[PDB]
Amino acid sequence: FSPYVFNGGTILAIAGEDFAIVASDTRLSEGFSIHTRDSPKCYKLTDKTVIGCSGFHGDCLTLTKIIEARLKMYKHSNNKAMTTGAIAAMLSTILYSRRFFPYYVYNIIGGLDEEGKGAVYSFDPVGSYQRDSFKAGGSASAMLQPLLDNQVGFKNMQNVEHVPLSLDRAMRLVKDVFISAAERDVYTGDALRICIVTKEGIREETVSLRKD
Amino acid sequence: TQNPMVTGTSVLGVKFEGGVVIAADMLGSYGSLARFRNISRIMRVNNSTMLGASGDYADFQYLKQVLGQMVIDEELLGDGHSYSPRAIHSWLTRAMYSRRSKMNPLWNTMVIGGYADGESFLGYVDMLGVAYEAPSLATGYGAYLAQPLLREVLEKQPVLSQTEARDLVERCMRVLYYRDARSYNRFQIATVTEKGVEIEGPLSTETNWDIAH
Amino acid sequence: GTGYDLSASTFSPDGRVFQVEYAMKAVENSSTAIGIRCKDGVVFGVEKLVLSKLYEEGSNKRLFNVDRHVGMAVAGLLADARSLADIAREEASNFRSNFGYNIPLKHLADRVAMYVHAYTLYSAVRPFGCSFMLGSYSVNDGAQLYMIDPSGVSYGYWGCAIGKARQAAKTEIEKLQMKEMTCRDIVKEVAKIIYIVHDEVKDKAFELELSWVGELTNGRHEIVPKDIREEAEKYAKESLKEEDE
Amino acid sequence: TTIMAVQFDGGVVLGADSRTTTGSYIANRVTDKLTPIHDRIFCCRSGSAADTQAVADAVTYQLGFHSIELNEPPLVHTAASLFKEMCYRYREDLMAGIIIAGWDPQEGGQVYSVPMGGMMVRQSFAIGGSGSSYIYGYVDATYREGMTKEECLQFTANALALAMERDGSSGGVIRLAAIAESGVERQVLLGDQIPKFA
Amino acid sequence: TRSEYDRGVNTFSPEGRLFQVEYAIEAIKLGSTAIGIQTSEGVCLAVEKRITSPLMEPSSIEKIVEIDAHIGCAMSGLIADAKTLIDKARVETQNHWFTYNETMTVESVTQAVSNLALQFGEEDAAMSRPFGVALLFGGVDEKGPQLFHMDPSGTFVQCDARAIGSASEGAQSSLQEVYHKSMTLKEAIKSSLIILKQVMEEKLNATNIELATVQPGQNFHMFTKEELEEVI
Amino acid sequence: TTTLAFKFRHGVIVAADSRATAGAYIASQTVKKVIEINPYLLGTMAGGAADCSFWERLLARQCRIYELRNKERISVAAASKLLANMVYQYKGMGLSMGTMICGWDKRGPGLYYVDSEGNRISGATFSVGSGSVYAYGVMDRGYSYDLEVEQAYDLARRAIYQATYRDAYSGGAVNLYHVREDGWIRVSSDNVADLHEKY
Amino acid sequence: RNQYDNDVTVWSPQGRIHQIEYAMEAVKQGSATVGLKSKTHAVLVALKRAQSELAAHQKKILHVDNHIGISIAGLTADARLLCNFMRQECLDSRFVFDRPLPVSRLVSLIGSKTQIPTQRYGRRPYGVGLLIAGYDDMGPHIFQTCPSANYFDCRAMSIGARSQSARTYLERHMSEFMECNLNELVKHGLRALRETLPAEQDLTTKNVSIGIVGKDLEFTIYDDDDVSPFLEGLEE
Amino acid sequence: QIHSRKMNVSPDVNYEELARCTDDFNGAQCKAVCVEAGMIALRRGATELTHEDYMEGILEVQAKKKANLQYYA
Numbered sequence A: 001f002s003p004y005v006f007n008g009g010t011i012l013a014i015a016g017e018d019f020a021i022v023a024s025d026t027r028l029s030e031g032f033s034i035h036t037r038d039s040p041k042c043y044k045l046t047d048k049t050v051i052g053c054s055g056f057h058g059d060c061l062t063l064t065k066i067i068e069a070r071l072k073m074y075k076h077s078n079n080k081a082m083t084t085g086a087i088a089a090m091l092s093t094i095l096y097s098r099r100f101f102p103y104y105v106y107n108i109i110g111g112l113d114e115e116g117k118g119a120v121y122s123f124d125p126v127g128s129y130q131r132d133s134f135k136a137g138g139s140a141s142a143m144l145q146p147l148l149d150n151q152v153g154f155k156n157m158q159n160v161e162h163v164p165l166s167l168d169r170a171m172r173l174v175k176d177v178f179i180s181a182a183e184r185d186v187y188t189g190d191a192l193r194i195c196i197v198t199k200e201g202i203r204e205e206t207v208s209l210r211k212d
Numbered sequence B: 001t002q003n004p005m006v007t008g009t010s011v012l013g014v015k016f017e018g019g020v021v022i023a024a025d026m027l028g029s030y031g032s033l034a035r036f037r038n039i040s041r042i043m044r045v046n047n048s049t050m051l052g053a054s055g056d057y058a059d060f061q062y063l064k065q066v067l068g069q070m071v072i073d074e075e076l077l078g079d080g081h082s083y084s085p086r087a088i089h090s091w092l093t094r095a096m097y098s099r100r101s102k103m104n105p106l107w108n109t110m111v112i113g114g115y116a117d118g119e120s121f122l123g124y125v126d127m128l129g130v131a132y133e134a135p136s137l138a139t140g141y142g143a144y145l146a147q148p149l150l151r152e153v154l155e156k157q158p159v160l161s162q163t164e165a166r167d168l169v170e171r172c173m174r175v176l177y178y179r180d181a182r183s184y185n186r187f188q189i190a191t192v193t194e195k196g197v198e199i200e201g202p203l204s205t206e207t208n209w210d211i212a213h
Numbered sequence C: 001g002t003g004y005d006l007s008a009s010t011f012s013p014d015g016r017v018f019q020v021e022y023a024m025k026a027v028e029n030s031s032t033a034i035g036i037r038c039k040d041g042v043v044f045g046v047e048k049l050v051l052s053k054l055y056e057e058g059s060n061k062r063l064f065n066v067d068r069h070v071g072m073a074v075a076g077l078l079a080d081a082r083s084l085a086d087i088a089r090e091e092a093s094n095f096r097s098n099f100g101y102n103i104p105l106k107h108l109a110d111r112v113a114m115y116v117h118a119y120t121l122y123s124a125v126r127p128f129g130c131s132f133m134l135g136s137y138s139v140n141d142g143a144q145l146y147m148i149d150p151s152g153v154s155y156g157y158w159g160c161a162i163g164k165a166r167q168a169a170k171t172e173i174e175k176l177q178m179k180e181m182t183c184r185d186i187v188k189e190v191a192k193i194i195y196i197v198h199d200e201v202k203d204k205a206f207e208l209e210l211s212w213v214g215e216l217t218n219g220r221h222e223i224v225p226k227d228i229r230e231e232a233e234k235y236a237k238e239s240l241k242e243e244d245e
Numbered sequence D: 001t002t003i004m005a006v007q008f009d010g011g012v013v014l015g016a017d018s019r020t021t022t023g024s025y026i027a028n029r030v031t032d033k034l035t036p037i038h039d040r041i042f043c044c045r046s047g048s049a050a051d052t053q054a055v056a057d058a059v060t061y062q063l064g065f066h067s068i069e070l071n072e073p074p075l076v077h078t079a080a081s082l083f084k085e086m087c088y089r090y091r092e093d094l095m096a097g098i099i100i101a102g103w104d105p106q107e108g109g110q111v112y113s114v115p116m117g118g119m120m121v122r123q124s125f126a127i128g129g130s131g132s133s134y135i136y137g138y139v140d141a142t143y144r145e146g147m148t149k150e151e152c153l154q155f156t157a158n159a160l161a162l163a164m165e166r167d168g169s170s171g172g173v174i175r176l177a178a179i180a181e182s183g184v185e186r187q188v189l190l191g192d193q194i195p196k197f198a
Numbered sequence E: 001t002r003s004e005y006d007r008g009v010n011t012f013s014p015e016g017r018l019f020q021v022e023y024a025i026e027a028i029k030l031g032s033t034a035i036g037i038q039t040s041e042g043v044c045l046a047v048e049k050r051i052t053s054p055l056m057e058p059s060s061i062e063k064i065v066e067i068d069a070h071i072g073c074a075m076s077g078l079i080a081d082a083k084t085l086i087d088k089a090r091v092e093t094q095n096h097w098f099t100y101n102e103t104m105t106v107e108s109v110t111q112a113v114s115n116l117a118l119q120f121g122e123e124d125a126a127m128s129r130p131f132g133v134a135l136l137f138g139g140v141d142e143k144g145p146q147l148f149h150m151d152p153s154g155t156f157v158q159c160d161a162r163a164i165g166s167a168s169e170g171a172q173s174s175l176q177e178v179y180h181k182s183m184t185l186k187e188a189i190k191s192s193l194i195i196l197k198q199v200m201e202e203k204l205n206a207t208n209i210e211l212a213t214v215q216p217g218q219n220f221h222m223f224t225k226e227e228l229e230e231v232i
Numbered sequence F: 001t002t003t004l005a006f007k008f009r010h011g012v013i014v015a016a017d018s019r020a021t022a023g024a025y026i027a028s029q030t031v032k033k034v035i036e037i038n039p040y041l042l043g044t045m046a047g048g049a050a051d052c053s054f055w056e057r058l059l060a061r062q063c064r065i066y067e068l069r070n071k072e073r074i075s076v077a078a079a080s081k082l083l084a085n086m087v088y089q090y091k092g093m094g095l096s097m098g099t100m101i102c103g104w105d106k107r108g109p110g111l112y113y114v115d116s117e118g119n120r121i122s123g124a125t126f127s128v129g130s131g132s133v134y135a136y137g138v139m140d141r142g143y144s145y146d147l148e149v150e151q152a153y154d155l156a157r158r159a160i161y162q163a164t165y166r167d168a169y170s171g172g173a174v175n176l177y178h179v180r181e182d183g184w185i186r187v188s189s190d191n192v193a194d195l196h197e198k199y
Numbered sequence G: 001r002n003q004y005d006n007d008v009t010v011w012s013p014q015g016r017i018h019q020i021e022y023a024m025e026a027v028k029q030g031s032a033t034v035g036l037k038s039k040t041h042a043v044l045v046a047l048k049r050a051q052s053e054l055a056a057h058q059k060k061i062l063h064v065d066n067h068i069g070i071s072i073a074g075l076t077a078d079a080r081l082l083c084n085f086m087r088q089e090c091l092d093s094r095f096v097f098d099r100p101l102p103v104s105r106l107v108s109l110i111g112s113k114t115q116i117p118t119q120r121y122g123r124r125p126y127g128v129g130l131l132i133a134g135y136d137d138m139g140p141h142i143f144q145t146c147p148s149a150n151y152f153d154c155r156a157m158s159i160g161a162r163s164q165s166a167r168t169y170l171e172r173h174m175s176e177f178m179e180c181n182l183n184e185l186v187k188h189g190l191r192a193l194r195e196t197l198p199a200e201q202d203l204t205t206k207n208v209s210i211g212i213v214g215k216d217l218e219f220t221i222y223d224d225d226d227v228s229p230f231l232e233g234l235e236e
Numbered sequence H: 001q002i003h004s005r006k007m008n009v010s011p012d013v014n015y016e017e018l019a020r021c022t023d024d025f026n027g028a029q030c031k032a033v034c035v036e037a038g039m040i041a042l043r044r045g046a047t048e049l050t051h052e053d054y055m056e057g058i059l060e061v062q063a064k065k066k067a068n069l070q071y072y073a
Helices: A057-078 A084-097 A141-152 A167-183 B057-077 B085-101 B142-156 B162-178 C018-027 C078-099 C105-121 C167-173 C183-197 C226-244 D049-070 D076-089 D149-165 E019-029 E079-100 E106-118 E169-178 E185-198 E225-231 F049-069 F076-089 F132-140 F149-166 F192-198 G018-027 G076-096 G106-118 G164-176 G184-196 G224-231 H015-022 H026-045 H051-062
Strands: A010-014 A020-025 A042-044 A049-055 A105-112 A118-123 A129-132 A134-138 A192-197 A202-207 B011-016 B019-025 B042-046 B049-053 B110-116 B119-125 B136-139 B187-193 B197-199 C033-037 C041-046 C063-066 C070-076 C130-136 C144-148 C159-162 C209-214 D002-008 D011-016 D034-036 D041-047 D096-102 D110-114 D125-129 D174-180 D185-189 E034-039 E042-048 E064-067 E071-077 E133-141 E144-150 E156-158 E161-164 E209-214 F003-007 F012-016 F020-022 F025-028 F041-043 F097-105 F108-115 F125-128 F176-180 F183-188 G033-037 G041-047 G061-064 G068-074 G128-135 G140-146 G150-153 G156-159 G208-214 G217-222
Touching: A010 A049, A010 A105, A010 A118, A010 A141, A010 A167, A020 A042, A020 A049, A020 A105, A020 A118, A020 A167, A042 A057, A042 A192, A049 A057, A049 A084, A049 A134, A049 A192, A057 A084, A057 A105, A057 B085, A057 E106, A057 G076, A084 A105, A084 A118, A084 A129, A084 E079, A084 F049, A105 A134, A105 A192, A118 A134, A129 F025, A134 A141, A141 A167, A167 A192, A167 A202, B011 B049, B011 B110, B011 B119, B011 B142, B011 B162, B019 B049, B019 B110, B019 B119, B019 B162, B042 B057, B042 B187, B042 B197, B049 B057, B049 B085, B049 B187, B057 B085, B057 C063, B057 C078, B057 D076, B085 B110, B085 B119, B085 G076, B110 B136, B110 B187, B119 B136, B136 B142, B142 B162, B162 B187, C018 C070, C018 C105, C018 C130, C033 C070, C033 C130, C033 C144, C033 C167, C033 C183, C041 C070, C041 C130, C041 C183, C063 C078, C063 C209, C070 C078, C070 C209, C078 C105, C078 C130, C078 D076, C078 G106, C105 C130, C105 C144, C105 D049, C130 C159, C144 C159, C159 C167, C167 C183, C183 C209, C183 C226, D002 D041, D002 D096, D002 D110, D002 D149, D011 D034, D011 D041, D011 D096, D011 D110, D011 D149, D041 D049, D041 D076, D041 D125, D041 D174, D049 D076, D049 D096, D076 D096, D076 D110, D096 D125, D110 D125, D149 D174, D149 D185, E019 E071, E019 E133, E034 E071, E034 E133, E034 E144, E034 E185, E042 E071, E042 E133, E042 E144, E042 E185, E064 E079, E064 E209, E071 E079, E071 E209, E079 E106, E079 E133, E079 F049, E106 E133, E106 E144, E106 E156, E106 G076, E133 E161, E133 E209, E144 E161, E161 E169, E169 E185, E185 E209, E185 E225, E209 E225, F003 F097, F003 F108, F003 F132, F003 F149, F012 F097, F012 F149, F041 F049, F049 F076, F049 F097, F076 F097, F076 F108, F097 F125, F097 F176, F108 F125, F125 F132, F132 F149, F149 F176, F149 F183, F149 F192, G018 G068, G018 G140, G033 G068, G033 G128, G033 G140, G033 G164, G033 G184, G041 G068, G041 G128, G041 G140, G041 G184, G061 G076, G061 G208, G061 G217, G068 G076, G068 G208, G068 G217, G076 G106, G076 G128, G106 G128, G106 G140, G106 G150, G128 G156, G128 G208, G140 G156, G156 G164, G164 G184, G164 H051, G184 G208, G184 G224, G208 G224, G217 G224, H015 H026, H015 H051, H026 H051
Parallel strands: none
Antiparallel strands: A010 A020, A010 A134, A020 A192, A042 A049, A049 A105, A105 A118, A118 A129, A192 A202, B011 B019, B011 B136, B019 B187, B042 B049, B049 B110, B110 B119, B187 B197, C033 C041, C033 C159, C041 C209, C063 C070, C070 C130, C130 C144, D002 D011, D002 D125, D011 D174, D034 D041, D041 D096, D096 D110, D174 D185, E034 E042, E034 E161, E042 E209, E064 E071, E071 E133, E133 E144, E144 E156, F003 F012, F003 F125, F012 F176, F020 F025, F041 F097, F097 F108, F176 F183, G033 G041, G033 G156, G041 G208, G061 G068, G068 G128, G128 G140, G140 G150, G208 G217
16 A cells, blocks of 8 residues: 555746746646646745645645645734745744655745745755755656756856846746646646746736647 | 455546536446445435545445534534535545545545535545546546546537536446446436436446447 | 532432432523424424524524434523533434434433433532433334433423423423324414413513424424414414413 | 345345365364344354454344343344444454344345445345355346245255355355244255255 | 632632632732833843842842843742743744744744643643743844733733833833833833832842843843943 | 864864755755854754754754753753754664764864764764765875864865765765854855866 | 532532623623624624733734634633634634634534533633624624523624623614625724723724624724724714 | 612613622612612713613622723733
8 A cells, every 4th residue: 555646746936036936737647647637736825925846646735734724823823924934944844743654745935035035945855945046846857947057047157147037037937948848748738837926916827738 | 444345446527517417337346256236336415415436335335424424413503504515525535634644545536526606516535635626537447548538528618518418428437338347337327406416326328239249 | 508419429318419409490490491292293392582682583592403303402501401412413423323223212312311310420520400302203213202301311201391381381281182183283382382381571582492303304303494483473372362362 | 154145025034054164174064154143133154253253242242232222123224234333443353244134123124245344235135255156146047026935945045055066165054044023943954955956 | 708719720709800810910019020111222121139148149030031032031920930931931932943943023922921821720731820920021023122021810911111020010100101102222221220229129239130131133131240330 | 965074173164065866866056064053053964854954953942942041051062962862762763864063162172973873973073975985085184183274174175076076976065164162154165166177 | 609609510509500600700801892793794893901001902802714703801811712722623624624614613612612611620611701703604693602601693792891881782773784884884883882981981093993804804903003994984 | 770760870771681790689789789870970970870880889889899800801
């Protein structure tokens, strides 16, 4: 009896000066069956924080429910919505709480920090908790993150002006990277959901993606 | 339930524009020794919810016990509230998730159909705990071969009338009887609509073996 | 006082438990509740008192549904009433889950009676100060009614009344051919009973609670539908006028 | 072990083999697979001997207490439901299958089957045990809805005779027991009066 | 009359009073006075010590104790209970930082210390009498400087300036007179010292008073001997 | 991963790379392996990343409580022992933390190496991680109880650079911290590309 | 009495359990709280007392899960404990089922929880009179519960010191309810609190506390200046 | 009512509620409550009585005093 069945996932997150982006495919495919073509893997935890979870779907749902219940607990017991850093630390503790039967949920939190800039945290199931600039996770992470290394940090590149990553270029980056991921990764596909987070709120944009 | 002792087979579900129609064989299997055959695998949870499992029928009966007891308690309260299809789906998802975490899985796979507040619900609570709502559901080994037809039919024609959705589920159960070593040409197509839940007895597909000869 | 009445674990020097007796006395101060057994069902009525007009019609509800097919009618302290109702609910659920068929009313009464007996035995817990009745109907066993008082006695009753006016309610119930009446007429007669025992000058406001469980509903205990309640109340006003004549 | 049960309007007739081999070799030549639960309710045991006996005795205790407490005769439904709860709860611990039959007032002449698992279902005919397979065809081959008491007796004799004649795990005195209002009548077909089918 | 209603924390009186709770509130009075102030520039705490005689070092009559880097705590009441509730406060602050990686707001901290002071005799936790201590938590959270008073009955509230202890009723009036919103921490120090001098018996002189301040900046600062001399 | 910390009279250097390897895939080059347990102690990371991080966080909590309770400091030994005892209670259940706890105390400098296998060891200089076996030979041949601050910085930096060049799982930055009586400070942080040309 | 009012485990020799009556009295020592409903809303207006013109005002409306507010009049300790239990029940229901807990069932749970400590010598009755608001799928509610462990579904109710004034005002002006406006309902609540006042004093932006729930409006509390649009528009 | 006949009591008063608050009160104390409420109204410069004044009279007939206890909502 195997208590984990890799249900497939591709989440990506980009930080920035003002905007925080969290994109995720919408293919909830178990084993060899794409048995749900619509299953967003990004949840709006607050008005400044969006969580993307990849992996076993039951644990994804359970972790999301636990996190949101804890947001309500924090709000009642502290009369203030959690900050992005606070949610990151709390999720670290929640994940490590069960360190002897781990959650199979790779997590990427993206939101505005206290100052107001985009902040992205990356996790491993046991609870390692890093603050990155841009990070991809799930199944196609290996093929989404490197191109962002090329085009967001300008690694292996010079004579390049480090102009701030604008929102328009960030959206173009995400769209192209996920189109390539759909082309060359089967758990990708079945539409893309992009979450764009700024002062206005958690704007959601969705793009039709190769359905195969 | 570690070993699956006496198991069922596939269970289907489609979204009629004014109802949710689910289908289940009354077969009872024991590893190619088909036992009890007039076993109802579909339950009328309440006026606006119905359930159908495809794993171990004993665990299906336990879940029938718990769900029936819970709905009886709700009515007893009689405050007028009712278990929405989404509510039953979440309860069932948590039940299976807890049973898994205890490493005591509920070796079932359940479609939860219902009609509520001008909405149609159809969910897939599985053994481990994978749960979701989809326009068309097919559960068990028959899922692979059954979802294609429903998905393509909906994608080229989203809204399905009751008659055509029904005919589609009989066709799907026919292909199941044709391509499922653990099927039986005697099924129940329960339907929930704004009126209620109707379990229309032991139907039978017109298996045209002569079509292939 | 007496020096043997504190706590319910002490026999007074006659063979008497003053705590149970005070519980019964608290029982005999709540609004009246009648129940009658027919040939094909049992009907309950309760003399609900609206202690204020702010309360929605549908305030404290003294007719509770235990199991799909048993009605519990309670007079006394209603917090204890709800506790006893939850105890009976859980016991019906347990019986169904452990045996497979709907709880027989005689057994449910016996088990709830033993429960209240437990709470009269001990010195760390007071006996339940609220009496109640259990009624049901089944195609097999047949219509039944039972009373459970603080001391925990489950004597079977054809009809019964508990509360401020129980002697009057009895005296007036004997004026009925209960053995042969039917639910429809007994509902009106229950209305008459309640309205003859009620004291307007003393209780100011008032509202009526009614229910029946019988073959006419297939054993599913149901609050008397609105139309039947209204008709029964009309007949009760007419009967009060006729008695005044 | 091979066991069968069938219903005749007004009662039920149960049948069982009498072999109790434990991995072959020595056994209980003659056994009592049909155990009396309360008065009219019998249980056909199949599978592990110790587990079957323990479950039967436990259900006997619960059902007897329930009968005395209700002051009404016990329903075959209640007996089989108690067996079902026990087996389903101790699914892993317990390895057995039991067919619960008998007479009760409300729905006299009942035969439920509870195989390994919480599997709970009523049937007109129930087969079980290692030899179940080998008669699981000639139990439908000659199932006429409306058999009399005698008719079901020949039916069970024939079925279990073929089971024992084509299964090593079952063999010996075929024990049958028909229960109705008149009470349990128990018979034993010893060595030759069993139906010999060529 | 109060011979069977005030001998247990779980026996209501005809009035609806928890007389053991009022008795704990009274036991608060006995203590040495403390005065906490919260102004736009931080929070100040000035407390009176009751040194019986030398050979009793300064660092054993703990009226001010530091709660995290961003709160100070002034005690009024029984020392054992004060230690227990201060320990509860410290462990809570640090656990909240550990789990959420942020500084617990003074509302949360006083709420949780109150939550401990609630469980008088509840059979789910283990004390049997109210913690006979009244505390002042003066700190700097995201809402600017704040100061929260806790009474032994688990009630906590914000206080722009509050005095506690033996000199409670005799100093609330002075605080009422003198306090105004647009106050700087220097004014707060001088005013608190003046009120303490008013309501002490020994002559305030830098070894019969403690002072601390938590500012939106440097952490909780416990005034040292030279600073005491300067202010005095 | 590679990290090292050594005592050189003046203080204790704590140098570390930044790379988390998942099988054959590298998650990030921006790991932060040196741990601000307190303004007074520093903790290094090797092995189970989450195990190390969480257990040293709880150590931070307990040391802060201890500093408050005993209005004093927590000895480097007094904290290494707490971490060792805690990590030992859950022995063999899977914790794979190896770490160095370094700091200045009333007994001067102090460095201890505590791992999941209950090994609390005093030392002069240590190196942990998949690249420690590489970083340790260079560090041995070049370390001396007397070392100027800048030359010790250079020794650590180039040792970790060679560890990255030779071992695979050691890549990343060249984070370097100084541990002195007054606390710890961030000396330098330059990726390996810069060092490949500086050398 | 004098030997039958020392615990909730002893009946008096006339049918009344004295500790529960004492707790009922305890509920009256809080502050005025007037709660009320319309066909789409439920509003709770409470009088926040002041312990000194320096110390802030005690809160009296707490925020249980997004479809329950609660106004407390009684022991602050028991108010906090039952608030935590209600929050726990709401979150547990949200976890198992994905549906906000009906406010006619949360009340039942609270009633059972408060009856349990009125029949055992191990604790004292609770001491908070509770007005639970909330808008389940059916409609807005205003439930009242008193230490006696009886819960009432009130068209509009009040509790606390000087709560009769409110209850009589409700008698008089409740015929308008179920057809008023989003703000007019709050105005009626404010008038109820006005009548509860001791005169001389008035409804000031500080001592007035307002909480609102209803369709298209999750639970909200208007304190400090958030309440000015109500007091300013209130009829003199 | 009988002992308040000759007063200026406002219609808002709730004598049934006051009777509920009596709680083993005898009759002389009820008359004393009427009188005490009357003169509490006499103070404060008022023209009528009210339920709050009746409650205060009840308190002063038991000889207690209502204190806004700091540990009550």
